[PDB]
Each structure stands twice: as structure tokens, then as C-alpha cells.
Design a protein around this ligand. Sequence first.
Ligand code: ZN
Ligand code: ZN
Lengths: 107, 764, 375, 127, 248, 149, 50, 99
Amino acid sequence: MLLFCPGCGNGLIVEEGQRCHRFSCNTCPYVHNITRKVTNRKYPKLKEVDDVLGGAAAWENVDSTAESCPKCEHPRAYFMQLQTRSADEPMTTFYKCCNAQCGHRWR
Amino acid sequence: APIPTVEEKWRLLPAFLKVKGLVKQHIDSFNYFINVEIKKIMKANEKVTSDADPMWYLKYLNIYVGLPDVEESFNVTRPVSPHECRLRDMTYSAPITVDIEYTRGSQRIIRNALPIGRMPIMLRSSNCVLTGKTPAEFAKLNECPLDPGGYFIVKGVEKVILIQEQLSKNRIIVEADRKGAVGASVTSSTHEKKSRTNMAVKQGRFYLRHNTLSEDIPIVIIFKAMGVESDQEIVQMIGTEEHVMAAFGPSLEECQKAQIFTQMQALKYIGNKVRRQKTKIEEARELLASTILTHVPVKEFNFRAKCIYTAVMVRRVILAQGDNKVDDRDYYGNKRLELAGQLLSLLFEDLFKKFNSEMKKIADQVIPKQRAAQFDVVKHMRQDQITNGMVNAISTGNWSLKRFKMDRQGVTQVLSRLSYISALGMMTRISSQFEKTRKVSGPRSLQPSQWGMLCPSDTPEGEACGLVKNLALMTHITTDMEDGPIVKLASNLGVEDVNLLCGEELSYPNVFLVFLNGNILGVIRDHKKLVNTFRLMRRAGYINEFVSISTNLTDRCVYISSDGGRLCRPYIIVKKQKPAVTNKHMEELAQGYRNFEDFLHESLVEYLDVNEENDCNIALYEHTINKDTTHLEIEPFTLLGVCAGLIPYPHHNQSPRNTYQCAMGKQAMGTIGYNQRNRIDTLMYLLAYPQKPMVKTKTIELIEFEKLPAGQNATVAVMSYSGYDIEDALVLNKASLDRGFGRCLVYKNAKCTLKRYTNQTFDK
Amino acid sequence: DDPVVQEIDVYLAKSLAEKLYLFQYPVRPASMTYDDIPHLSAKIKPKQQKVELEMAIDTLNPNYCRSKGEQIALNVDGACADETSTYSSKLMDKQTFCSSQTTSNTSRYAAALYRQGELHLTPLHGILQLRPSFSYLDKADAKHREREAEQARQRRVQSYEFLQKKHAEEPWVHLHYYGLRDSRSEHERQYLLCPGSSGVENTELVKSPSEYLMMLMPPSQEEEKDKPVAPSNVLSMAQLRTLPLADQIKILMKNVKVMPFANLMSLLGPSIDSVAVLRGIQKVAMLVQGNWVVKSDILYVLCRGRDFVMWKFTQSRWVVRKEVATVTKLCAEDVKDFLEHMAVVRINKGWEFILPYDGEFIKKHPDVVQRQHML
Amino acid sequence: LPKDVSVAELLRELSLTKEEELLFLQLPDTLPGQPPTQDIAENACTLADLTEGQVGKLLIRKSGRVQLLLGKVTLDVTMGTACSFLQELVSVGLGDSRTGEMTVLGHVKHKLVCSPDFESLLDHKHR
Amino acid sequence: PGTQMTLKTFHFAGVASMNITLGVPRIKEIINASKAISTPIITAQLDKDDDADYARLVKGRIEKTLLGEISEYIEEVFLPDDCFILVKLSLERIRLLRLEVNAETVRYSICTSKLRVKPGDVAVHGEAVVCVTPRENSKSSMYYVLQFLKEDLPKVVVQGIPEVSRAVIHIDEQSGKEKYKLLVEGDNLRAVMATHGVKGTRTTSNNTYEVEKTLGIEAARTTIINEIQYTMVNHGMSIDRRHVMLLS
Amino acid sequence: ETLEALILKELSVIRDHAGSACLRELDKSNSPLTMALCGSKGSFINISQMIACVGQQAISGSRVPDGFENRSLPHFEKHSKLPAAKGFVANSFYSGLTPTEFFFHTMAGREGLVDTAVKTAETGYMQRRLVKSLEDLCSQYDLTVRSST
Amino acid sequence: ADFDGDEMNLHLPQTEEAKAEALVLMGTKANLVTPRNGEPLIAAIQDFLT
Amino acid sequence: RMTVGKLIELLAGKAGVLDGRFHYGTAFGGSKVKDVCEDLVRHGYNYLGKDYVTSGITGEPLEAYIYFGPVYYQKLKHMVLDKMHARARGPRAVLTRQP
RNA sequence: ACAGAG
DNA sequence: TCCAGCTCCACTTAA
DNA sequence: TTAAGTGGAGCTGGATGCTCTGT
Ligand SMILES: [Zn+2]
Ligand SMILES: [Zn+2]
């Protein structure tokens, strides 16, 4: 990330001193000792998942005493939760039911 | 429930044709030239001064144009009709008279009317003999009441300066390169100098390119040259989003690799890259203050208002690289039209400056050497520098001005007199910008921006399909406004000045810029109150009625365009689902109480524009009106032009058929005018017994086609007969051709001159 | 709506009208102020306002790498000269600030110290922006370069060198800095106020809203109207409201200076009330016992002969006799311009005016029963 | 962060805290006055021509409207771009020929931008 | 037939995507015999063509998969003793995409045309995290080159072919079967013939230069014949095969 | 792009089921029906287009692109992907066309005109190259095909 | 050709060998099929099919 | 070519010559079909223009009805007397000895 | 050099 | 307006 | 340490439909 000198407002560079790494200006004496953990997370865009789970994938989210799907009222359906974008998104829930003479897709 | 309907709403169109549109565009540009621009060009060239021997000066005071004259053999002068100048193969001009003030030792000697040149007077302009006359007084001049005018007469032929189509100057075009990169450019054209600047992103770091620099210099060194030296203020003016700083970072990292941290260092870096025509610092400072972005003004070497503009350019490149929103050239908010006056202004300015330079050369030859008797420059006012310049640039068709680097060809064409529609159809043509270089298939299409401004079907078929177009029936082309009260109104409506803030306010979500023809007038919050209050000040008669306003909500700008040469179209204002024009208003128009300007003043009819009808919502008919409609179309048959207004039921046809009729309708045999017998042309086709059409459009009544028609009513059975009518052939009747059907006349010409040579002998 | 809350009085002060500036720091945030930094100098040129400050950064803090300060001071200063030198010691101790001017005119910007209940305004004298200077790097480059290595018409005013020679003629004016924490800052903050009553009526600000709209948005260097209505109030039922008669009685009084009043009451408009249109029509011209004829001081050679001949329209129904036409003292060349087109010829009787004594006593109006003789 | 409005600024400076705050307000170019015997032309009347005294009454209305009634005219008041950098309202005193005093009076955070109500100035006499 | 072809529309090879240059510029691109053309397609046949679970493995085996497309957060971490870049592989989306990639594969995908980073500079501390300690490039570069790798490291490829833009599983419609062919918009024929799971004996291409470089001159002749005849068929024209045979 | 396929599916159902409803009520000895059955001039699309319903007007394969900002013309609301607002012409050539439908039909026709006018410089140069490269070939008497040399 | 203002050229050979190469090779009765695929081109047209 | 506008111009002109009108063919409007069909039946003609035709060669009537009406045909400038051209041998150029 | 025509 | 050759310069292997 | 063979990038030079019919 860009960080700028409070004095002259040029761009700081990271360098190493005798006790710490420092943010340092190239044009004025100002330095800032990195005393503690500092971070910057990008969170880039992940792949699409729409055509990846279709067609009898290796799902696993099913559990004992799981709810039946609302239309058929049978537990013959899978359900999953995934991030669709990066993991700062709150996970969305989706489910699909597959029964005899019955095909549907629901949210 | 049906919305009530005004049925006489059509009658605004014959009121509109009294004043504006339909060759009145050419007339209102030529009168604009010979009434203000010939004074404004003379103002900026008011004094010539000899280099040697000072305290001697020629000062121009006032210029005129006057009435058309002919200069005969024995120095007798008389006014002249345009038809006498058609027959005798002479030009139709008027002498330019200027009064001066010069010095022959005696310091104040003046004149009153010194003829320096002859201006070709366009027909039915303010100085023609035909204006303001009755139809029984056109008979004594051998001229038609229906001949539209707008054309010149030079050496006997009729020549038309065609409408050109050019891109708008002083505008940031964000476009893609050939290799896929996205950059920007703005053709910074003013009256004095035209030049293009660029913005290249060839390595992920921003470079600026120009025709003066021998290498493209990075943009942060240019910012450090323009007085902002901190990197923080530069990144403020670019933007404060995360991905914008990520995209801009490798340009700061390039600038810190060189030792450029100071303004004088940046100017010393720029001065080592200038192609040579105090060198290093000052030939860079005068460069950035006079040539690069030369329309954004620097007052006293204050470079703040140019830094904001170039940061707007870099931010638009950064935002357009993410989602590929390049600007199309073919949107007609970006096209401008250049009429005959704006070409003759450039031509006469170059000719007048060459006249003053030739006169200064003669003055510097005969002041230091010859004689103590003080010469006057009245004995060196040669008239043939201006006259032959005007006549040769109109008659030949090239406008090669060395001062402005303009090298156009094929501007003027001979006015075609095949029929009446061919003469009127030529006075609405718009030649295009590219002029048939390669098979583009990009501007040859029909973009939806031409609604009501240009004609859909009327185009030539062949190599110029889409590159020669035609105006619609109800259009108008603006001229240059005085630019005075628009700034004085915009400064009182919440526009902060741009100097009173850093660059961080430009990246706010609720802060919009305002532009005036490319220059930044500042920023503003609550743009809707600005737009609505400015439209109320336009409707109330304070701001001139052709000053458009728009809002690009994506790029966050509020444009104001006071410039000249852009297309307008009238509309009916709609306020809360009811039209502002009532039946009472149209009854008052039909009885004669009011005119179209009274519809303009009372906030009933307002002019729109191609950039301004991007904001508005228009209904075609009265029963299309819902709650978000601000304007109502007056007549939807004004979408079709003049040559497509002969076709009956043209919405039942297929669309190429109307194009083929727009081609054939300029070639039908007919009658030229009422002076078709006293007229000697190179070629003239007439029909013997013409008849007016039986099924006719209202455009036919508006342009008076059925007073002199082209065609005959044929009784037609539609059947297969005799097998000689297989592919498009048609079988006539021998006893109808004998009775006069289809009988035509062909007139030609044969001229012969008998000249007297320099040796005193003569042809006989 | 109604002003339900906080009808705050606005007061205007003038005591600091020639002294108050507004400095703003484009690259320094609004939290990290300069309240603590020990300032050293404060310089100004009073015309062409260019304020150059200097501020002292401390050395013993851990945000001052002395290994770089020694090197930059060796690069800027001469190594042992110190006769004229930007820094006193062996280090970089200062950070100099250089101003740039925002606008020329500040007649519209006003600083506002809001207290409780009221708001005091004070006009500024300028806005200056203070950016950190980088001149010492170019001075270091100067010390690095000096160690090793009947004339024609001209334009100098639009150049840089003549501009720098023209600005630097103003001598520097030094000032003593007094910070925000000083007790002088509280004492000179009360000159932003103005002492006055709670009720003060202003004998300025008298201009009506129409006059203010006309004032800020001027007429376009002077108006020219001739035909709003396409005949100039003369055809299309002979009079018409597009040029409004109620707004302009004057244009028809120029045009139709002789007409019956019943035509005017029918053609002026139905929406305009009766006594208001009588007061509008009455003041623009003369009346002769119910015959309204043009105010000759506006129409036309003196008005005194015009007033006496308008009195002659009152005297005799046979308007001017040929000797009394000379008595009324008109322009002798313009007797046909004044009387011929405005009257009727009958034999040996002079002139018969178009408007006889009409039915104004038949009309219900009671005030021009007696206004015509006092006017 | 949400964007604040002028009624929300003139409510906190009286109810929440009594502490004074330095506002920086932009007026229109000509104020509805006359230059009093100032050797004229109907030119611009600004604050460099008026005298001290109550120059107007500021009317805050229901539903957020804020008007500056400056005599017979009611003006309009809107917030400007919110500045978030360091603004210092300083004084400069040239009490002598070449030496004097500089005093800092405080800080400036908020901005106001005033504009004439053209709809209300226009609806009295249209054109 | 070059004058007869109106440069028509409605051509997608039956998938409502994968736009192809047809008409006069297609015949122009064939007879110019250029080395690179717009819209190339390598049509591959799959051997175990019964199920879609087999098709998506070999789809992800050839398609260009970026490191920035499988990492949930890519961060710099500044420390008082060191500075580096930390990349945590979102292994859930690795398990869903059926890919052969983990941290040791990403370590091997790094040090292939990136700044000359050393393999010692990259560690595999977990089964997700991959830290990249930068160095001094020392060729017009400062050690603050972490900003270069902060946007450059998500453009390295960990699985697939570098030249392939995209790919789409294509199905048939006939009632007798349901089998899965593979449309590869790419410009590397030898790579698609060599990946496990793709029947290399039955895959073709549009670009004749790749067919000449991989399979020989006689297969390039047959590709010219088939492609000119296919372009002539798709616009309603018909030419006897002896003419295109003589041209090839 | 999913929505575009469903709308181009539904707007092609209207043209086909409206054009198969006009051909069931035309009598024999109709003139365009006779000229379409014998294949001499015309087709069934022309009869079903100038009687029943002119189809979706398409410029280069897709619906009418936006020339203004996020809409096709100012006469329609922004972001609307309706049938009528993007090129569908509900009228035939018998009942006339509306202004927006006529302008969209002219947009669809000028593309055909400009392809006809661009084709001439597009093909003749290619045939010049093919002739200058192929003209030496001749079937000989021994059933070979040899070049000039 | 379509008979709508359409012009066509003519060339008269001047030698007997140029006559015989025009009559046998370039005849209309010897060019009833196109050389492209072998489909007839000189055949019936409109009003001879209707 | 789908010119229905000629088929309506013919009918409108026929219904407008029988009672002295000029039926408008204004774009996006004009005289409708239902108002010109009723002016033909009032004057004794068919309501769609198609007329009973006795032929002129044989003298016996045609089977189909033929569609009469006035259409406004215009004559174009391209005449054959100014386009016929024939060179046997004549003047040649000077540089290249070819016509 | 420009406009046409196929 | 689009596309093959020609020449300059870093980038590894190898001694 | 450096000689050398081969990659990649910028510059350069070529090309862009057939005729008549008039000024
Ligand atoms: Zn710094
Ligand atoms: Zn189920």
C-alpha cells in the first residue's frame, strides 16, 4: 500500500535499519519503525461455481436430522453453502431436489 | 381514459419554415460572416508596422461589404442581377470597402472607402438584390421565386459550399489503441493553434506524447513541472480509490527512479526532450504554458487549472481500462457541422494576413532607400490579391491554408439543375469526415443518434453509402454565442471554484464537475438543482435558447455547450402529463396573433440537442405520455428529409426502396423554375406536359413541389403481358406516346469566345 | 412551511476586513495540525500576497534518521562555510513552506464565527495554500554543480523573467508568529464579532426581488423589442396581448394615439381588473374630457406649445383655427405632421378632431369626472 | 460516512454543544444593496461596501430548508464540498511599515455555499 | 461465391457462443496462409465420453487457471525482521474444481518467468500458505518491488495450458446417445493432443499452421480442403471438391 | 445473454405462428402464394412479413444496440429490454409502420446496403490473387497437372 | 443482368480463328452448366415458371 | 421487394380521381385504406381496384381480374440515344498507340 | 479533381 | 487503414 | 570473465474493385 510522509508528502519506501525495518522518505529524514504486524489484504475474485457443482458432484454437507426439502417433503436433496466471490462475502445457501418424476432447482 | 389531443399541432412546422431550416442555414451563416466575422478578423489585424523606420503605421478602422457591382469597359458602374452574371460568365461579387489612417510625415491622413477586394455574395443573403422582393419583381431580374439560394456564382457556374461534418474540438476522447491498450487524447484546437496531445499506457505506466517532444515523457514529471511537487497531491488529483492507486503506483515508481523531485529538475528533464525549432527551463515552461493542452488557460504561469484537467484525463483512462467503455466517434453529440461562413472566415483571414504581409514587404522596400518625399500605401493597394483568392478558392474547390494546416479538397460542387428536387436536395447535403479512405463499415451504418437531425433513407447508393447524408425537414444548426452570461449564472448557482480544493474532492461520490466547452468551471453538489435552474433560466429568456446542458452520470460531469455548429430540433414541453401547447395557442397562431418566437418565449416550445435528449424522455404521440415524459414530438414525418418527402406511404415500403427513390427522384425530368426559358445552361432536360401528383405528402406542399412538378400520371394495369416485361421491364402504349405521354426536351449549349491578344490583333 | 426552529440573527463585522486570511494545507489532514510545532519565521509581501513560513522539526525524536540528516545537510550546506547558510547546525532542522495563490478576488467569501443564537460575518482578504517546499534539493544540486563545473516590437510582460523581476521589487515584511494556544489568540478572536443591538434595521438592502434579478443577471448590454405580436400592437383585432398592453400602454400610445376608449377596454384583455387598468391607462397620456391622446412630452418642438395645443383640443370642438394654430406655437413645417392625419377637414372650419366628447359621464368612472381639468 | 446537511449542522452547534465553530461561507457575487455614496453604474454590491449592523436574518424551516433572508430577498443556503484537510483562519497585521504580528484564530471544518433562489426571484415577474 | 456471401449472421457452431469468422474473411484467412488468425478452435474428442465428471477434469487440465483465481486472499505482511507476500490457497475451490494443485505445485509454478525469484525464497509452511520473500532485482528496480509482485503474482499459471483462452463442454442432441466433445479456443495443438484424457487420435483445428507444425504437410492439405468446404457450405454455396482439392 | 436467447426465442415464435396463420386463410389463385409455390419470385417469409408480422430487426446478429446512453432511442425508458424497445416490429407492411419501428427497419436495411457496397473491394482483389497464382495450371495429355516450368 | 438501365459490352472478332474459338468454346449452347458444380444456369426465369 | 406503398398509391389515386380529391400519402399517417375502398364502391368500381378485363388480342375475357389505377411515373434522364456507342477504328492516343 | 450509372 | 522483413539489444550456455 | 547463437521489440515498406458518362 502507498503510505506518504507527513512532512513532505513524497512516497515512502520500506528499508532496513539497525534495529527495525523502516518506512523511509527519499527526500527528508523522516522514518517510521515497523514495531508491530501490519497487513493489507487484496481479496481477489474467485472462479464461477455455477457449472462446477452441477451433475452429481462430490457434495458432503448433508448431516443426520437434516431438513427435508420444502416441496417434496423428503430428504432426497442436497444443500450446500459457499462463498460465490472472495471469503469476505457472507456465504449464500442453495439447494437442489432430485426425485422420481420430479426435477426442480431452488434457492 | 384517452389523453385529449391537439389536432392542429402540425401548424408549428409551416411557422418554423418561415425563419429557420431549409437553406436558411446557409443564409444565416453567410450573413453571420459578412456582418460580424469580417469585423472581428479586421479587429485582430488592425495595425501593420514596418520594421525599419518607426513612427509610421497603417491602421484599419471599419470594414464593409456593400452591394453587388460590375466594372465595365469605360469605368461605368451599375448594379447587376444574378442572371446577367449567369449569362455573361462573370462572378457575382461586391467590393470590400475599408477606411484607414496612415502617415506621410503629416501624421493623420484618413480615407473613407478604399476598395481592396471583392466578396462573392451568396444568393438571397443580406447583400443580394433578390432579398425582400415581391414575386412580380423577380420577373425583372430573370429569377425564380422558388430558387432557394445558398449558392455562389463564380465565373458563370453555380457552386455550393457543402456542409462539412467534423468532430468536436476540446473534448477528451477515451479510446482504444491498435494493440489493445486504452488511452486518451484531446485535439486542443483554438483559433490560433491546433495540436493533439495523447496519454499512453504502454507498460502500465502513463506517458504523454506530443508533436513537439522527441520522446514520450512520463506524466508525474509533467505534474512536477507544473508546480505540484508532492506525490501525495498528484495521487489526490488522480483518485483515492484502492485500485486507482494500485494502477497509478508504477508511475510514481518510475519517477522516483530518476532524480526528478523538484520543478526545475522536471523542466530541465523536459527541455532535454524538446525538438528545437534561455533553452532548457524556459523552452519547457513556455511549452507547457502555450502548446500542450493549449485550450486550458494559464493566466500568469499558474498551472493549477491544467493539472486538474490532466488528472481528469488520467482518471478517465484508469476507470475505462477496467470496463471497456471507450467513446464512439459516431455519436452525434460529438460531431459538429461547419457551414459556408466558417470556411470563408478562415479563407479571408489567411488572405487578409497575406495582404498585410505583402504590403509590409513593399513598405520595407521603399521606406529606407528611395526618396524624402513620403509615399502613401494607397498607390500599392493591389485589389487582385483578395479577389482572385476568393474566386479561385471557391471555383476550384480547394482551401489549402498554410497557416492552419488545412488541406481540404472537394468542398464545392456544381449545383445540379436536373430537376427542382436536385437543386433543393443538394443544399442539404452533409459531406463526411473520412471521405472514402477505406471500407470502414463503422460510420457508414445508421446510428440511433440521428433521430430527427438527419434523414434515415436519403443517401447515395454505391461507394458513398452513408458518407453523404442529408438534413431532416425540421432541423437547425447553431452559431457561436457570446459566452457572457453563462459563466455569470453558473458562478451564482453553487459552483465552487476549482482552485479552493485539493484533488480529493474530485473522487467523492456526491461531487460532479461542470464543463463549458472543455474548460472546468469548478465542482458542484446537488447537480439536479443546477440543471433544472439552468433550464428555467433558458426558458425564461435570459440564457440564449440554444445553450444545451447535459449530465453524464457515469463520468460525473455536467456539460454546458455554448459552441456553434451543432444540431438542434424543436419540441413541445410537457409538464405533468399535459402538453404546454393547447388548441387555443394553435388557433392564435392560425389567426395571426403570434409567431414561433412567442412559442419559444412563453416556455412552450424549446430547442433540444443530441447531448440534451440523452437526458430527456420524449413521446411520439399524445397517447404515449406517461409520468416520466418531459417533451413531445411535434411531427414524426419530419424524421424523413426533403427527397424522401415525395414518396407516398413510405412506411409501407421496405427500406432500400425509399433509398432507391431518393436516388431516382434527383434525376427525374421536370421543370427547373419559372426562368427555364431565359436560361442558358450546359445541359437542361425538360418535360413537355408535366402533371402534379395525385397522391402527395405534406412535404410536397411545404416545399411547393406541385407548382412545378416532375412526372406524369400513367394509367397502369399490373399484369404479365407479352413476355417482354420479365425483369423490371415495362410495356408502354403506342397510342399514348403519340399523344404526348413522356415527351421530353433536351437543351444543350455551345459557347465560343473571341479574344483580343497582347499584340494588338483580334479574333474574327 | 413555517420557520419552526432557530431564527438565527446574522450580523456583519468589519473590524478585521483588511487583516483576515485563510491558510489551507492541501497535503495535511484536518487532525494532524501544526499547533505544537515551534514556528520560526513568518514572512509576507502585502500586495501579491505570498506568505512563506518556516517550521522547526525536532531531532531527538525517533522519527528523524540522523544518518540521512547529516548527509542532506552536507549536500545542501557548504561543509564548513556557515557565513550564509540555510541551516544553522550540522543537520536539517527546518521545513520551509511556500504559498500559492488560489483566487484574485475574495469579495464574496466570508468567514463566519457562529456563537450561540447569532452568526457574525467577516470578509476575507485572500485564500492562500501552503505546500511544503523542495527548493533545498535544487540548492544542493547548485552546490553540486558549482563544485565540479529603434528595436522592434517585443513582448516581455507575458514572459517569466520580467515577471520575476516585477514581483521581487516588493520588499519582505517579517511577522512574529503567535500560535493558537497563546493568550493573544483569544483576545484577537473577539474582533471577528461586531457590537450592536438585537434589533437593527438596515437602510440598505431596499432593492425588490425583481430589481435584484435584474441586477445580478443584467440586460444583455441593452433591450430591443419591436414585434412580440407580429404586427406591432396594430393589427390582429388591431391590438393584442403578446406585447402586453397592461405591461406596456406606451407602445400603443405611440402607435394608436387617437382611438376610442371602448376599443381599449375590449382589446386590452379580460383578466386585468377594472380600476387597476384605469389607473394603468390614466397615467401614460393626456385626456380631453374622455379623449385619451398621447403624452406629447414622450411623443415629440417643445412640450409647452404641445401642452397649449392639447389645451386647444379642450377649448373648441373645431380644433385648431388657422390663426389659433399659429397661436398654439407648433413647428410650422410639421403642422401636417401634428394635425392633418389626426383630424377631419370640413369647409372653412379648420379641423374636426377624430374624438368628440364621448360617454365618460355615461361611463360609471367618477374620478376622471374631475381629473381632466386638474390634468 | 453519511453526508451532512445544513439543518443538521445548525442543530448540533446550538443543542449538542455551545462551543463556537468557524464557518467558511460563500455568498453570491452581488448582494441586494446599493453602494452608499461610493462614487458609483449599478455595479456589484458586496460585503466590502456595507457597514456593521444586523445585515440579515437566517431562517431555518421545517423539512430541512435553510434560507438567508437578507432584506426583501430570501436567498438559499447549501453545504459545499466537505473539506477534510487542514484549514487555519489566520490574521495578518501590518501595524507598521515593515514589521508586524501574525495571529492564528482557529480552524475551519465546514463550508456553506449560498445561491439566489432563481425560481422564487423569477416567479414574481416572468419573461 | 465471395461475391455471393452476404457476410451473414447466426453462426455459433451450435453452442450459442464461440463466435467464428466466416464468409469472405474466412476464405481470405485460409488462402493467405497466415501464422496466426482470429478465433482459432481446437476441437478435441474425449475417450471415455459417457459422463460429465470425466469431462470437467480434462477441461480444467487444459484451460488457463490463474493463481489469483484460486486464492482467497493475497496479502503483504510487514514484520520487524522481514517482509514477504503471503498467499493462502482456497483449497475448497480446489476440491470443487477437481484440480491437481496444492502448495508444492504453486511453489513449482513460481520461478518460471517471474523476476528471477529463487526457489529458496519460496516456502510451503502449510498445505495452503505460500510465502514469497522478495529480493533486489538490481536492474532498474528498488527493493519496494513488492508492489510489482503484489499485482504480478496473481498472473502466474498453476494448472493448464498457457495459450488456451477458454473452453466449453459441448453436447449433442440426437436421441441415440449423449457424448461430450470439447471446444478449445486456443493456439497450441500439440498441448491438447498430449494431455491425459483427451483422445489425441481424433482432434482437429482451424489454423493450418498449427496442423502443419504438429501433424505434417498432408494433414495441412486435408485441413485446407475441409475448412474451405465447410465455409462454402455454411453460406449456402456448393463447390465440387476437385477445385478446392486443386487449390490445396 | 441468457435473457437475449429467451427473448429471441419468444419473438421468433410470434413471427412463425403468426405467419403460419396467414397461409391457412389465403385462398388459392392468390398471386404471391402462386409465385411462392412455383419458386419463381419470392418466398413464404415475404408473404408472412407483408401480411402478418414483420420480424425482429437485427443488426449484425443481435438486437438493436444502444446509440444513446443505456437505451436505444429517447422515446423509451432507460435499461428497458422490452421487445418493442429494441427492434421488434409488431406491425406488418399492410397496416404501416410506426416511427421507431421504421427507423429500426432502416437500420436493419442499411447494413445490407453497406455490405453490398463494401463487398466490391472485398472480393475482386482476392480473385486477382487467385488468378495470378493459379493461371499456369493445365491438364496435360498424360493426365498430369503441371505448372509452367 | 436485370434490365433496369443496364449496359452491356460487345466485341466482334476480326479473324476466322477468333470466330471458331468463340463459337465452339464460348457458345451459349456449350455453356449451359456452370463449371463450379455442374448446375444449369441458362434455364427458365420468372413468367416462364409462373 | 414488398412495396405495398405502390399498391396503396394506385388505389388512393383511383379513388381520388373519381371525385376530385388529392388523397394524402403523408408519412406515418395519410389517407387510410378503409376510406378509399368506400369511394370506389360509391362510383361503381370494385372496392379493391381489380377490374373485369376483356382482352384485346382474342376478344375473350381474362380469367383473373386486373388491377387498374393511376400511378405517378416519372421519366429519368438515362436515355439510350445518349448511351449508344460504337467504334470500328478511329483516333488513337499519342503515347500508347491504342484507342 | 468531383458527381453519377450498373 | 492492416501485415510480413530487417535490424538492434539483452539472455542464457560454455570455455 | 566473455564469445556467441537466439529470443523479443521497434522500424520500415507495401497494398487496398471494375468500367463508362459528363464538366
Ligand atoms: Zn518525507
Ligand atoms: Zn426432488
